[PDB]
Symmetry: D2
Subunit: 310 residues, 4 copies
């Protein structure tokens, strides 16, 4: 049984990690979370230890290591800014890391972790589940058959109620900003499908809307991201729908369904089989997100302006 | 359309409150919780306000009240020691209070809420779902048919992993202790079936077990409470059970480990129709738990001793 | 003997409040703060009650009131975004409020407080110690003696090390931003001296620097505000000084880096003597600070530019 | 210049650590505390880094050493239950530790630290200022110029208002209980003066009082500890004194109610004369026994007067 510890046990995404650890036959040995509604853990791993203090959690896994029972993986589902130091914890404990996205917030942290992987003999992986979504895998094989850059329009609107503005997720120093926190997976999907960003522009940057343009090696991309559910197109909004994804590639919609229940598990599966997404796979989206977070706004040309920008 | 606010939204029991508010066709106007994994609320009430600061939640509700739009109920699912001051907030805001058990921790607090109900024109109600469990309402019907006090064996085992001992639930000043935080349900069930407690003894009192004997108007009761999954009887531990709740009366036995899904809803239904559990109904279990809190351990006569003790 | 309760006991400013209350012959009945290094309080008011939960602090004060022993004042030293809801608490308890600056973050809040004072017959005061600084009182007396617009240069450097960036003080939602949390002192000084701001520009807004230009009824004002200690005039840096506050107006320069030891007690004295700063006195600086918060940066004309951006 | 990092910067005792570091020529390079009224630090070490997340502080310190700029000491002033894990962080970073009392909460943690010291070549020290108090260094003096068991009465009343009951200091899992959190100083003083405890009893253990009786190699000791100020003897009381610390040894009283001892401790620690695991271990063993022994009824001759 591969042996896991987990951070962020009380959070929204952690149950998918409990399910994944179970479904690959792993065992959860310990969890860390300063918050304590975590009792769902009893249904999966009735024996797991639990800590509220990071140093106590670390001291415990270090004793496990020192007496031959260390965890193989620290799975990390804490707020975004804690990814890097908790990955650093995984490696100093002689463990591999399996971190929620964004893997870390800064290109400079990716580099530092490259070095520590070397000197530590351990590896850093990340959960990028769009990469295992069967429609998007299908999209990538097709594109492999095609010549020429694609023109892409990417839209993602994901309504959040009021609690969202009271959470770490809108605190730029913890979340990296809207584009990072609700965008990272789409910029990662774009890098995966279309390669490196030669040019990056940001055209709107407010508390509820980020929008802009990328020129990547394989695509020109106009993109729009929002947490305000009224950018949902009116035919779906009159239905009380709260979200809307759409990637169109050369005017054609890319149909990937919501229905998928298993993608965290598939990621965990790939990772254990030595096919996981490492620092090299993750880095380009992080680099773009860091630029998006820090670049001054620019005025878009008409070719370059997302349609929702008007 | 009854208007609710709710405290402790991120917690373990909150989701059953969100379902009861929906199912009774109320609307959730605002929630408070310093912890912010609360996004499940979007699935129910995508417009509700949200606060992490109680003073700000209170000023918002007060504004609504002052402009004629105040909530009807404050549903309270925060840790036990805050039930009382949040019920006080409820009344001072013009809302009835609908509070998780233990309604409050101390009988002196019960008596203060009685005065205040009078000065504020609103009511304090409590969630005592064992009182609407159909097997127990059934058990109560049979008991009413018979003359004489009954001899009762009450066994309540609810396994918890290590997380429980890092939570407020084991902090006696926040939870009132194991016999309050878990036991109040059964002390209240026994008050409802058998009336007042004439004599109370505690025989064991450790971080994981509490046990003792009560003489109530209608019954003699030996009781055993534990958070150690190991006291679940062997036949049920084999099939993976962590929770065992049984009352045996003269030797007829009812299991009620099961069937709680939407008993919260039913409590909400009764409470809205004016047949809710008020301060008069809740006081006696509260008085008993408070006594069990300060009481010195005593040696049990063998007729007074629960069978899981020896 | 004036009865006080206090919020924010564990913080940087609270010790001036303890001293103020003691020195005007007040007594501290109770305090509130989630944080608990507050033991200094025993050496002022060894019997005061202490709460970490706002709802409990409030129920307690309300009991005191209900039995004819309410506090006379709630002194408020919590983070800036909590001022409004805590003054609302004080008034709903039949106490006056004496709040730290900024009295509140939003002008519209000043208008609700005004209505609550009439209903209540209680008053909301604020701590504006610059208005009692002898150097600034004397400046104001001299300026009284001459008609015509004044030409003003205001420099306010309050050097802060790295800890400041992890504090609520740099979280815009809680502090209002540098120009509010520190700036309000000098925007209020300026309003007090020269009246209403007719025109407002912001030239720099970074994490350590805010600067801009005002035109008020009585004066034009070039201002610069920084928490970077490198901005202290070299001559004074040489000497270990980390804070520099001066106002230069028409051929005279008044320094006010020091002289603050007793100013909080003098504010309490004036307020207890019915000469405190109320909503009317505080509102203009609050209005300007709220404007500065949202205004887009603009290119300064050279004559409108503070010399430190020079 | 000796390089320190500090934990617990926002708390009650931290300013004595800032003063000590400054006064022995040290430099504070970084601090950790989840709480943020820490601005006092700018008037000592205006350049120090500051962290609220332990993992982030530790990554930073590790970076410092992965490139030759490590701290030499980690000064630890966080709640008691965090001493052990923070000392571990110190040793794992290649730094020595200088931890507030009690050094750790359990005897078994002492043994594990002793192993880590050997693996690492680094050392764990602790702040036991009563050992540097000139009035107790002088009691110890007079003492070792006679043998034979002493008869000792220890009274330690350290008055605290209502805020104390809302603090980690009364949470037994964090503080170890009253006899540990306050008691450890006098249990250590006694072990230092009189050696190992051979017999231990507890006669009262309430939220405000712990009292009992010890027999040590060199003394019998009746002891009483309270955070309730009303146990200050009615003479010193009617005048609003709120702390009283007395050890009477065969009828003669030394009083240590009123205090720079932290600096002396840092000095001796950096001078190679600090208080290590060996020194700290006995008080820790006794405090652990008392947090856990069942109460017992004292014989009259073994019962502290104040009972
Ligand atoms: N793949 C997806 O579909 C998906 C969806 C949501 C979130 N996420 C990602 O998962 C991570 C968690 O997001 P969440 O949505 O579950 O947010 P969350 O706020 O619901 O959960 C956060 C949890 O982390 C805890 N935490 C805070 N500090 C910690 C520490 N020092 N150590 C351990 N735990 C700590 C908090 O108490 C909280 O319980 C984020 O990185 C986010 O980007 C991914
Ligand atoms: N009938 C049942 O089956 C049942 C089961 C579990 C719990 N409960 C009761 O429900 C209440 C909650 O229990 P829980 O299990 O969900 O514990 P929990 O720890 O999971 O949930 C606690 C929630 O309260 C929040 N909280 C803390 N302070 C608050 C404040 N000042 N205002 C608002 N919220 C605050 C915490 O952040 C947390 O999110 C308790 O009274 C418990 O006795 C009943
Ligand atoms: N006039 C001045 O020179 C001056 C100086 C500093 C602060 N102030 C003002 O005083 C207030 C406090 O500033 P601070 O310097 O002392 O910063 P601080 O961060 O040092 O102290 C803040 C205290 O508020 C507490 N707190 C948080 N939430 C609370 C709540 N709901 N109720 C009660 N307390 C709560 C925190 O735990 C902390 O102990 C701010 O408004 C600030 O603008 C004025
Ligand atoms: N020798 C003495 O006279 C004396 C006096 C007080 C305390 N102490 C010891 O010092 C330590 C601190 O006591 P205190 O009086 O100053 O209590 P305190 O509660 O005033 O200070 C505690 C500080 O620790 C911080 N903290 C909490 N978790 C932390 C973490 N993971 N990392 C860093 N800091 C964290 C808190 O935020 C707080 O600022 C305790 O061991 C106490 O026994 C010694
Ligand atoms: C009826 C009753 O006694 N209610 C009390 C009872 O709650 P309930 O009935 O739901 O316990 P049960 O185990 O049957 O839950 C089913 C699942 O949820 C999981 N569970 C349960 C509790 C929890 O906090 N977290 C959690 O994940 C658990 O792992 C199970 O798998 O114990 C709580 C507690 O001591 O904490 C008390 O606060 C309640 O007042
Ligand atoms: C794939 C992807 O976009 N991942 C990101 C995505 O989450 P996901 O896709 O699951 O949300 P989706 O809208 O599809 O609905 C799921 C349901 O749960 C609700 N939801 C959503 C987030 C949350 O914290 N809580 C929550 O209840 C929501 O109301 C729905 O009802 O948004 C997160 C966020 O917005 O913070 C990011 O942190 C993630 O990186
Ligand atoms: C030597 C010794 O016993 N040390 C222990 C002792 O501290 P010390 O000697 O400093 O307190 P003394 O009673 O002499 O009061 C001094 C003044 O400060 C105030 N004081 C005191 C403690 C506090 O936490 N806060 C505070 O303001 C108090 O109000 C007085 O005004 O109590 C601590 C505690 O209670 O936790 C333990 O952590 C220490 O290890
Ligand atoms: C009058 C005025 O400008 N008030 C504002 C001003 O505070 P004040 O005048 O006291 O600071 P000054 O620069 O003189 O430092 C004095 C010493 O204290 C130390 N100091 C200072 C602030 C602090 O938070 N902590 C601290 O330890 C500092 O290291 C110095 O050693 O900054 C506060 C803030 O920065 O948030 C605002 O909340 C105030 O409203
Ligand atoms: Cl822990
Ligand atoms: Cl809020
Ligand atoms: Cl409280
Ligand atoms: Cl940090």
């Amino acid at each position: 049984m591969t042996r896991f510890a987990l951070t962020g046990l009380a959070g929204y995404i952690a149950p998918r990690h409990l399910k994944a650890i179970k479904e690959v036959g792993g065992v959860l040995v310990a969890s860390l979370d300063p918050a304590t509604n975590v009792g769902l853990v009893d249904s999966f791993f009735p024996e797991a230890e639990f800590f509220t203090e990071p140093e106590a959690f670390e001291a415990y896994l270090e004793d496990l290591r020192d007496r031959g029972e260390g965890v193989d993986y620290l799975s990390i589902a804490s707020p975004n800014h804690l990814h890097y130091p908790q990955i650093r914890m995984a490696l100093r404990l002689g463990a591999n890391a399996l971190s929620e996205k964004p893997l870390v917030l800064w290109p400079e942290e990716i580099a530092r972790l490259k070095e520590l992987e070397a000197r530590t003999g351990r590896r850093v992986y990340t959960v990028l589940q769009l990469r295992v979504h069967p429609s998007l895998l299908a999209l990538k094989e097709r594109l492999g058959q095609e010549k020429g850059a694609k023109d892409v329009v990417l839209t993602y609107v994901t309504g959040r109620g009021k609690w969202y503005g009271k959470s770490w997720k809108v605190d730029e120093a913890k979340s990296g900003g809207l584009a990072t926190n609700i965008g990272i997976h789409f910029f990662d999907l774009l890098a995966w499908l279309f390669g490196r960003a030669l040019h990056v522009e940001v055209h709107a940057r407010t508390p509820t809307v980020n929008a802009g343009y990328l020129e990547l090696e394989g695509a020109r991309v106009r993109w729009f991201l929002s947490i305000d559910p009224s950018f949902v197109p009116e035919p779906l909004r009159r239905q009380g729908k709260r979200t809307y994804r759409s990637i169109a590639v050369d005017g054609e919609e890319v149909e990937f369904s919501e229905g998928f229940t298993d993608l965290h598990t598939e990621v965990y599966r790939k990772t254990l089989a030595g096919e996981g997404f490492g620092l090299d796979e993750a880095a380009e989206a992080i680099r773009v997100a860091a630029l998006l977070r820090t670049l001054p706004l620019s005025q878009p040309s008409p070719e370059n302006r997302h349609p929702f920008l008007g």
